[PDB]
Amino acid sequence: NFNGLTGTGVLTESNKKFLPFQQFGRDIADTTDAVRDPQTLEILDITPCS
């Protein structure tokens, strides 16, 4: 959980170009696929668990 967004998965550190006004990322299927650290700026791709 980062800023109220809960979930489960594996973080893989992507280089997705999140802009300053972007904190969450949803894929083509309206499914979360990336998030930003509320403290640092690292963009982590929420990949699915096994």
Partner: peptide, 18 residues
């Protein structure tokens, strides 16, 4: 002074942080 141009593409923003 006060003329009237049309708003071509003017009038769209970002209603999200996605």
């Amino acid at each position: 002074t006060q003329s009237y141009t049309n708003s071509f593409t003017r009038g769209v923003y970002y209603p999200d942080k996605v």
